[PDB]
RNA sequence: AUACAGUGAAACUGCGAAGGCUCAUUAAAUCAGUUAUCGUUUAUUUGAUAGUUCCAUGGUAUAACUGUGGUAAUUCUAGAGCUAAUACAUGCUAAUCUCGACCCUUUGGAAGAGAUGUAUUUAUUAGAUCAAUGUCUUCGGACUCUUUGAUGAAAUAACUUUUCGAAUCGCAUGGCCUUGUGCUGGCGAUGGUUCAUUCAAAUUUCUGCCCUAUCAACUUUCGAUGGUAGGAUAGUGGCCUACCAUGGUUUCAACGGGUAACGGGGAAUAAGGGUUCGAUUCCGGAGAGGGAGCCUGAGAAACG
């Protein structure tokens, strides 16, 4: 009854935890019970993960948010107070949620793909992201599928990454879900299979969608740290 | 009752002096972005 | 003129009521000598 | 209750004028004090009593806005209003500086002035109260210090009151009593005037007519003072000319020239300002510019000068004769200005203008030959009128040629100033040649021949109406001139005008070839005409996207040859914009409605890219951007880009064939594209039949040979189950033929 | 009303054997409330959470808009003479959207005499109604959904556009 | 160009642009045609996907019946049986489409029972 | 057409082709030892069951690893145990003789069809087989 | 503890039950994925988000409760008397925002003019230019056609029986001397209008394994096919009605024929040898005695 992304062992139970509503969707997130209890194993059961949630160790996106099924989606920096645990969780190359450990100056921010820019009411420019941070007043040159950098103390955009040909992009969606390498090709079609294409070890080619891909930095310099093997 | 009449009015004028000033305080940042653009 | 004036026979109204034999209390000769003019 | 009282105001008109005046009289009887305040001023006032007075002014505003025609006005309401306004002024200017109740009574006073201006906004030419001077003296003694108070972009309490008092018939009695226009003119002649200065100027311009139609000699002297203000405000309508509301200036200047002639220096200043009205902004319309030039002529008919304004009016006619706008109405006003400018040059100008502008007759061609046989020594307005006739005004073709030749004869008989006049002739002929004209382009070519008075035969054979042997001799003359920035730009402009999208004629390839040959012969002049070659390539690059891209693609490819010769000569420049234009060509490559032109554009970018080390870093990616549209399953576009790639291989050297083959094999890689894209290198190896007996690594091409003849391709071609692939003649017995004179 | 579904009817291919389903809640067709003239009564019906819907049946105070200046002012209703979305609808004299209904134009007289002074540049076949009182005006607002009667006056082009019709 | 009642007019001559690589002809920017559901002036907005094919019939007005044959790699009887599709489409003031005439359409806002596509191109 | 996220094609299967004869040959030619138990420790119910098979001790090692790894005893879940424990022990006493399962020799399942005779490196060209050798 | 003070039958309250059996046989229309909704609803999740004030606190009317009773009798009752609210419903409320004539030079703004919302439903329109590294240098400038960038192709005239501008709490005596609660004065949770997200639903693009031409015509016989307008809608929609046109699908398989459609379709887990046994979601839709009509809710044609 589980998805593939959670890295959930089959010998666990019968009812799978539906995440509650929140920032991200159901299909692109993992809740805190499947995060803490059975992935990096700070708990043994739902009772004691509710106990540490009542103790309020979790500090995801700089706020506490004491809830069992809180849908932590892409790169919400899970922060735990004891042993200064800073966790940025991204996608691995085979579809799961690889939770990388980072440090404090990297967990002081996150980034987010812009979805739409609106002239909503009363002359106010407007920007949303995958956690829905409706932050005030970016520059006019925010296209769709660019990348804002959230402040995580206040909410303001601090840095901006422009989407164009020659940018380091992350793909979350479809049969390319979780690949990095961002350059063999660029092809913007007019309604589907439109993208920037991603290399491999032998620099192979790949096809995805615009909304299923979003930028993380430059060719060699992302200010996100990434795990390795 | 009257102490609540003190605190209600004080929190109301403080809410005004926070919100209605902060709104123009980021509208001026929009003005800086528009001047630089 | 599709649904307009279907000259068909319909099921529940075919015996919805029943007639009467004498009907008018007048005679038909009383009709003729009633509105000859 | 504000919405309820607004409903009561929206339904507070249903009763008659008697009941409306009765309700207004009851509203007046709240805190009038006519026993105490109808003499001079009030007895006492309070904060809450002024709040009843501020509410009374607000109720007066609401009543006037509801009944905004009649309003039920009464002298009791007028006295209550004057008492409230005087009490507001008295309380505001007599209370101490604590500013709370003072700003309350000040926003009571501005709202009461707004309600007072609403009464004249509603019932202006209805009452016209004969006891106006009571309220007039009250408001004057209140607002004496409002001298420059109403000078802003939005200050419209007393400025709107002054405009209302000035825009009436007999309510200007309080204006012409002592002063309205004095304080209005003080704030008008204030130097920090915002765009209400034009409103005040239009109000005084409309209000001078009531002061002129007034029989009173005081108002006659006030109209004289309004004309004196029009003469003393000679900087306001100059500095405030930021919009297209110059019709107010043209309506005052015609009114001033028709009204008052008071000084010869004033008439010279008016003529110089109306000369700046045509030499300040190019967005002046026809009627406004005609009335401005007619007002300059009307000031010149009274009190013009003999040398300075003579030359100023001559420059005005020298601009207006090159204009001649609005179906000879501006030409008739220019002839009147030339006949009023009062000089010997102006006398010859009026003669030679009236002898040609005689209502569509043969006197134009008569007068051209007349002044040719009797050539005048003024020659400035003569060259203007004979260059407007040499432009696209159909008649006087041979007369235009004779006029240009006679101007050249005078410029040679001078032997300095008339050579600078020939510089203006060349700067006019340049914009004439870069145009869509037919007769005037030939007249500009005749002027080029007269300035050239081998080269003269070349010019007369370019203007020979033959165009086949003529264009062949033009190409041979370009070859002789190859074996000049503006001059070659003008020659190439005339050639591009004779071959400017005229696709109902043949030899357009040789015409664009002659254009590119003259561009190359100008680009060889690197010390002078490198900038002109860059500008010509830039204009051709703009034409490569501006709605037509067939011959402009070959123009781009053949203007790349100047870059190729320059890079071969260099063996410092600006690589940045060249690389950005290469990116723009790569974006035009991904267009395919422009596939063949885009393949030639890729060839053009590769011909231009011959830098020091950037031709190593980008040529493989350029070959990738070329072949990515031909490995794209197209029966004709693959062949056209194969022709472009064979031209690219013939252009590039043997050091680039390795990068070309590697990029082609890295772009086309899939099975059943490996059996079709051998035609690429089949064409390319024969395109490079002119390389020496050193070669590339050739492991790539022997890999191509082995995969296309051995194993699966052997099974595929030696089976009998494939429909049709016309690029498979087995195609592979050619690469060793390419390589035997190069590699082994 | 009944329904909103394609299941009861045939598509662009001509299919049969429907016998589909018990109709759901979200195929809700309410009764057609033909709005008339009367005393102002609006039924406040519920849908989709607290989505109150104003179903007007007997509305009078039409806010009709002077066109050339855009002055939406308050008036009464007389009757619709032409509306061939149902040619019996004008026989029964209801009041729906896009109908051409007659108005006693006395507040428009008041506004003209109030912001122009004199009484009567405007077209002659509407100057006749400026004199008489009843002018033609077409309803914009939806009394069956928003519960209101707003509209726009007929001024010249749109006037003759309807007068040549009927 | 007015054969029906009820103020045949644009609904706020009027002109807009959907963008995204589809031209608006000059009569459809400034012309007497109403453009009620033609997407260049229109009331509809563009979205979705864009399909291309030739036509079969254009008999009724505001009905463009496209045909659409396309390749599909059949593995069952290992031969390609040829595709055919149909879609009705509203008119545009740019081309009286006759038989043949490969044209393309964009998905928007169901107009009749079966049309979500309106013509944006002719070539 | 378009892509659709398929965990059944980027999921580690590795069991359609795991044949015990190939795995036994790999254990023979492995040249690294095999982690066998101290010899009495792997018989089960005083000999009432078998010894235990190699797959059963692999599965037991996995269960005890998961067991210690997240501190939870597994259970007596009725449907899964009535399937798997009873069917497993009955085919164990059928086919496992002395710690060795001989069930495979009584089973039709082609070796070379699924688990040998490579499908990706099929080398359907003379040139591709020539380059695969050299 | 003489206006409250702990146990607490029976009453109001917050929520609980938050998803269970049988019966007649639907061929991508039941289903699964997918495209979209600037074509739409949304409780809860999450991020954001309020400026109109004339000559010390507002009203009776009902419970529970007592008391008198009826009836064989109910979570059936009726009179009479009181009594409370975050129940009902009328109503008490400092002055700050820009342009800046003037500046006295830094402690710089005094005068004047223009201000000030939401929720509902109506119309006009804001939504072609200037800056250089260069055309000619006459080492000055009219500069955009060239060489590159930029503002850029909700402001207002009205309705509506209009919602509001905190009768919520916690942590912190803290600062001031207006000579007494005179101003309290710092922050955080709950409010509170609106937007977006999330959740879910409805439509909608396309794709997906029986044999079928002895099913070759169907569709206008629940509008057939489309156009225009209205109604109803959560909105798109012949979804329904007026008018108009005679369309539309099909041999490139329309439309129609049945079951090992108690079986099948990935609907899914796969198992270290069982090769169509071997994990499951769903057979189709209904039904709460029988059809019909109505009501409630973020969600329903309700297992209550």
Swiss-Prot record, chain B:
Cell location: Cytoplasm; Nucleus, Nucleolus
Source organism superkingdom: Eukaryota
Covalent cross-link Glycyl lysine isopeptide (Lys-Gly) (interchain with G-Cter in ubiquitin) as placed by the record, residue numbers: 32
Disulfide bonds, paired cysteine numbers: none
Record-stated family: Belongs to the eukaryotic ribosomal protein eS6 family.
Function: Component of the ribosome, a large ribonucleoprotein complex responsible for the synthesis of proteins in the cell. The small ribosomal subunit (SSU) binds messenger RNAs (mRNAs) and translates the encoded message by selecting cognate aminoacyl-transfer RNA (tRNA) molecules. The large subunit (LSU) contains the ribosomal catalytic site termed the peptidyl transferase center (PTC), which catalyzes the formation of peptide bonds, thereby polymerizing the amino acids delivered by tRNAs into a polypeptide chain.
Subunit note: Component of the small ribosomal subunit (SSU). Mature yeast ribosomes consist of a small (40S) and a large (60S) subunit. The 40S small subunit contains 1 molecule of ribosomal RNA (18S rRNA) and 33 different proteins (encoded by 57 genes). The large 60S subunit contains 3 rRNA molecules (25S, 5.8S and 5S rRNA) and 46 different proteins (encoded by 81 genes). Interacts with snoRNA U3. uS11 interacts with MPP10. Component of the ribosomal small subunit (SSU) processome composed of at least 40 protein subunits and snoRNA U3.
Miscellaneous comment text of the record: Present with 66000 molecules/cell in log phase SD medium.
Annotated protein name in UniProt: Small ribosomal subunit protein eS6A
UniProtKB/Swiss-Prot annotation, chain C:
Induction: Up-regulated during cold stress and following nutrient replenishment by dilution of cells fron exhausted to fresh minimal medium.
Protein's cellular compartments: Nucleus, Nucleolus
Record field: transmembrane: none
Family: Belongs to the AATF family.
Job description of the protein: Involved in endoplasmic reticulum to Golgi transport. Involved in a protein-transport step blocked by brefeldin A, which disrupts the Golgi apparatus and its incoming protein flux. May also be involved for mass growth or cell proliferation.
Other comment: Present with 15400 molecules/cell in log phase SD medium.
Name of the protein: Protein BFR2
Full-protein positions shown: 460 to 496 of 534
UniProtKB/Swiss-Prot annotation, chain E:
Gene3D superfamilies (alphabetical): 3.10.290.70, Ribosomal protein S8e, subdomain (1.10.168.20)
Keywords on record: Cytoplasm, Phosphoprotein, Ribonucleoprotein, Ribosomal protein
GO molecular function, one term: structural constituent of ribosome
Residues where Phosphothreonine is found: 61, 106
GO biological process: maturation of SSU-rRNA from tricistronic rRNA transcript (SSU-rRNA, 5.8S rRNA, LSU-rRNA); translation
Function: Component of the ribosome, a large ribonucleoprotein complex responsible for the synthesis of proteins in the cell. The small ribosomal subunit (SSU) binds messenger RNAs (mRNAs) and translates the encoded message by selecting cognate aminoacyl-transfer RNA (tRNA) molecules. The large subunit (LSU) contains the ribosomal catalytic site termed the peptidyl transferase center (PTC), which catalyzes the formation of peptide bonds, thereby polymerizing the amino acids delivered by tRNAs into a polypeptide chain.
NCBIfam families documented for this protein: eS8
Protein name per UniProt: Small ribosomal subunit protein eS8A
Organism: Saccharomyces cerevisiae (strain ATCC 204508 / S288c) (Baker's yeast)
Gene name in the database record: RPS8A
Curated annotation (Swiss-Prot), chain F:
InterPro entries, per database record: NA-bd_OB-fold (IPR012340), Ribosomal_uS17 (IPR000266), Ribosomal_uS17_arc/euk (IPR028333), Ribosomal_uS17_CS (IPR019979), Ribosomal_uS17_N (IPR032440)
Modification comment: N-terminally acetylated by acetyltransferase NatA.
One family name in Pfam for this protein: Ribosomal_S17
Subcellular compartments: Cytoplasm
Assigned GO CC terms: 90S preribosome; cytosol; cytosolic small ribosomal subunit
Alphabetical list of PROSITE patterns matching this protein: RIBOSOMAL_S17
Cited CDD domains: Ribosomal_uS17 (cd00364)
Top-level taxon in the UniProt lineage: Eukaryota
Keyword hit for Transcription: no
Functional description taken from the UniProt entry: Component of the ribosome, a large ribonucleoprotein complex responsible for the synthesis of proteins in the cell. The small ribosomal subunit (SSU) binds messenger RNAs (mRNAs) and translates the encoded message by selecting cognate aminoacyl-transfer RNA (tRNA) molecules. The large subunit (LSU) contains the ribosomal catalytic site termed the peptidyl transferase center (PTC), which catalyzes the formation of peptide bonds, thereby polymerizing the amino acids delivered by tRNAs into a polypeptide chain.
Self-association state and partner proteins as the record states: Component of the small ribosomal subunit (SSU). Mature yeast ribosomes consist of a small (40S) and a large (60S) subunit. The 40S small subunit contains 1 molecule of ribosomal RNA (18S rRNA) and 33 different proteins (encoded by 57 genes). The large 60S subunit contains 3 rRNA molecules (25S, 5.8S and 5S rRNA) and 46 different proteins (encoded by 81 genes).
Protein name listed in UniProt: Small ribosomal subunit protein uS17A
Gene name per UniProt: RPS11A
